[PDB]
Structure formats: C-alpha cells, structure tokens
Design an enzyme around this catalytic site. Structure first.
Site, short mmCIF file in Angstrom:
data_model
loop_
_atom_site.label_atom_id
_atom_site.label_comp_id
_atom_site.label_asym_id
_atom_site.label_seq_id
_atom_site.Cartn_x
_atom_site.Cartn_y
_atom_site.Cartn_z
N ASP A 40 0.81 -1.23 0.00
CA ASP A 40 0.00 0.00 0.00
C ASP A 40 0.85 1.29 0.00
O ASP A 40 1.98 1.31 -0.53
CB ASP A 40 -0.94 -0.03 1.23
CG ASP A 40 -2.30 0.59 0.96
OD1 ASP A 40 -2.36 1.79 0.60
OD2 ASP A 40 -3.31 -0.11 1.12
N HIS A 104 -3.94 5.61 3.44
CA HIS A 104 -4.57 4.37 3.07
C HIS A 104 -3.94 3.14 3.71
O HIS A 104 -4.64 2.31 4.31
CB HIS A 104 -4.48 4.25 1.55
CG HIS A 104 -5.53 3.40 0.95
ND1 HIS A 104 -5.31 2.09 0.60
CD2 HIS A 104 -6.81 3.68 0.60
CE1 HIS A 104 -6.41 1.59 0.08
NE2 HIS A 104 -7.33 2.54 0.06
N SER A 276 -10.96 -1.39 -0.56
CA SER A 276 -9.69 -1.37 0.13
C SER A 276 -9.85 -1.58 1.64
O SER A 276 -8.92 -2.03 2.30
CB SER A 276 -8.98 -0.04 -0.10
OG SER A 276 -8.53 0.08 -1.43
#
Ligand SMILES: [Ca+2]
Ligand SMILES: [Ca+2]
Ligand SMILES: [Ca+2]
Length: 340
Positions: A40, A104, A276
């Site tokens: 990520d 994220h 996600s």
C-alpha cells in the site's frame, strides 16, 4: 470487549452484517504468530499501530512520487500521497485536479492489527498478528513492477538489491488496483507468491464495474473482496461479478489515520469507504483462521484457507444488484470450520 474507546463504533467487527471478529477473540484467537503484509501507501508513526508493525520496505522507484529523497529504501514511511493542480496528469478533467492524503496503508493496517485493548483509539481484527508495511504507492499511485516486487518480497521472495525479508507473510493484503486484465508478468509474480504459501487478498475495485476488467481481480490465485454496507448490501462503488469471491464491510469503516491533508501532522482515527477497507477484514480473518489451525498443528495451503473463508460466509441482506461472492466473511464460522 476490548477497552479501546472507539471499538464501540466499529460495528464492522461485531454488529449486524459485520465479520463476528469478537466471537473469535472470545474463543482466544487473535492471529498470534501470523504475519500479514500490507502492500500500500506505507505506514504512519502511530501510537495505535507501532507495537504491531514489523520492519517493511519501500519499493517506490520514483523518488519524486515517494517524497523521501531517494528511490527504493528500507523505510516504508507514508510521506503522504496528496496532489494538487493535476500534478498526477489528466488536465483538464476536474476529477483529477486534486486529492488530500489518504493514509490508506495505515487505515488498512489498522483494520488488520491496530494495537487493541490498550485504552486508546481502535481495535484490529487480528490484533495478535503483526503487519509488514510494504510501500508501493506514492503521490500518483504506483508502478506495476513496484507493486508486484513488493507483493512477492512480502511473501519471502528474493529481489535483487533488496535485503531478504526476515518476516515472510502468510497473508498478503493488496488494497489497490489498476485498470485492465492481468498481464503475463503480474500473473507469474502472483503465482510465485501464492506457491510460497501466502494467501493474496485483494480489493475488488471501486469503479462500479465487472471485476474481470480490473487488475488484480482478473488474475488467478487471488482472493477478491467486494464491499458491503451496514445494511448488508453491495456498496455502490464496489466492483462485482464472478471474479469476486466474497465480501466484507466496506463503508463507515473506522481505523487509524493522520489528520494531515498533505504531510503527516497528528495521529488520529477516521472512517473511510472502499473495497480497500473490505480486503483487510478478510486478511484479518485469514490470520485468525491460521492462528486457530496452528493451535491444533494443522497446515493450511492458501487454497485451503481461501476455501474455508468463502465456504463459511454469512448471508447478505436478501438480494444484491450485482454478484459479490458467497456472502460476508464470517470469522466465527471460519474458525469453527478449522477446529472441527
Ligand atoms: Ca525512497
Ligand atoms: Ca521511504
Ligand atoms: Ca487501540
């Protein structure tokens, strides 16, 4: 219940159409002895993350997009992936003008293994496990080869010019995408990773299209995760179809972030939506299942683990508008399957 002040808001762990992770924690399984990789944006220095993070690696080859002064390096710190003024291309499309930092990788890592029962912030699904942050996404996303090198290394694959990973992961979380079907090289890298013994868990994608038209869901040997709501229905952005194998909560997902809109400023907690966020629920449950299998000396292949997770899902709220796999991942039922 864990004593984390915001756990009560994490409906997605314990409430209606959540993953029933609390039932497994109650049984004494928390992902102990399992390593999960998060491929990520990197990781934040965060009080509710640090204790559960292991050494990772920064695979971003572009020094500009990595914002850290160099190419590949041993510090997977998330410098922030914000951009403004179409810095990542696409002018004059208003949709591509600007974005704030997503944090994220940290939000995803928190869903897997936020430090839990520590009187602060949130809980994680597999809070007995450890995470290796494998940084492959910067300012303008990531190069395909950076993504797949990182994925492979995270499972214990050797990469030239990179020190060998001393914490190989049994579960590889890829909460990322990229348009189009699966390239021959990507598939090759994916098969190599899986055949080492690692389960690759991927976000189905957020384009409200068929997942077969997006990477990695078009690839073989990945477990493709769609996103559901607190209503137990498909999240409107979630990719769908035969290439989605199951679903997990993917909206109003509370996890670990930073308040910064650009670079890091202060550790905080915040809700996000996306497939996600659904994938790390599945990766977290996979780690719970491995910890349970370990307790009875049972070896699980990624194929066997994948089948347990798909086999034992809980029901959707009636009927969906598009196919989203067998159901919602169910940690309690999944663990029941392995313990017999
Ligand atoms: Ca760098
Ligand atoms: Ca770095
Ligand atoms: Ca906590």
């Amino acid at each position: 219940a864990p004593n984390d002040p915001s756990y009560r808001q994490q409906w997605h762990y314990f409430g209606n159409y959540g993953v029933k992770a609390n039932k497994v924690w109650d049984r004494g399984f928390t992902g102990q002895g399992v390593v999960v990789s998060v491929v990520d944006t990197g990781i934040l220095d965060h009080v509710d993350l640090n204790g559960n993070m292991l050494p990772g690696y920064d695979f971003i080859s572009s020094a500009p997009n990595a914002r850290d002064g160099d190419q590949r390096d041993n510090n997977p710190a998330d410098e922030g992936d914000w951009f403004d003024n179409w810095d990542c291309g696409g002018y004059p499309d208003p949709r591509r003008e600007k974005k704030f930092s997503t944090w994220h990788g940290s939000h995803v890592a928190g869903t897997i293994a936020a430090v839990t029962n520590n009187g602060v912030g949130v809980a994680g699904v597999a809070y007995g496990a450890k995470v290796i942050p494998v940084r492959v996404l910067g300012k303008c996303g990531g190069y395909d080869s950076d993504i797949t090198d990182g994925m492979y290394w995270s499972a214990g694959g050797h990469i030239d010019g990179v020190p060998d990973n001393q914490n190989p992961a049994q579960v590889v979380n890829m909460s990322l995408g990229g348009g189009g079907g699966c390239s021959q090289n990507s598939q090759r890298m994916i098969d190599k990773t899986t055949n080492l013994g690692a389960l690759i868990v991927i976000a189905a994608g957020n384009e409200n299209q068929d997942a077969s038209r997006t990477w990695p869901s078009s690839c073989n040997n990945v477990l493709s995760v769609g996103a559901t709501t607190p209503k137990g229905k498909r999240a409107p952005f979630s990719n769908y179809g035969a290439r989605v194998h199951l679903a997990a909560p993917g909206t109003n997902i509370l996890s670990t972030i930073d308040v910064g809109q650009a670079g890091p400023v202060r550790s905080s907690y915040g809700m996000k939506a996306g497939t996600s966020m659904a994938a790390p629920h599945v990766s977290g449950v996979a780690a719970l299942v491995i910890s349970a299998a370990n307790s009875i000396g049972k070896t699980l292949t990624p194929s066997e683990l994948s089948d347990i997770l798909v086999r034992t899902t809980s029901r959707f709220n009636g009927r969906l508008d598009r196919g989203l796999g067998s159901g919602i991942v169910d940690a309690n039922a999944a663990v029941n399957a392995v313990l017999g």
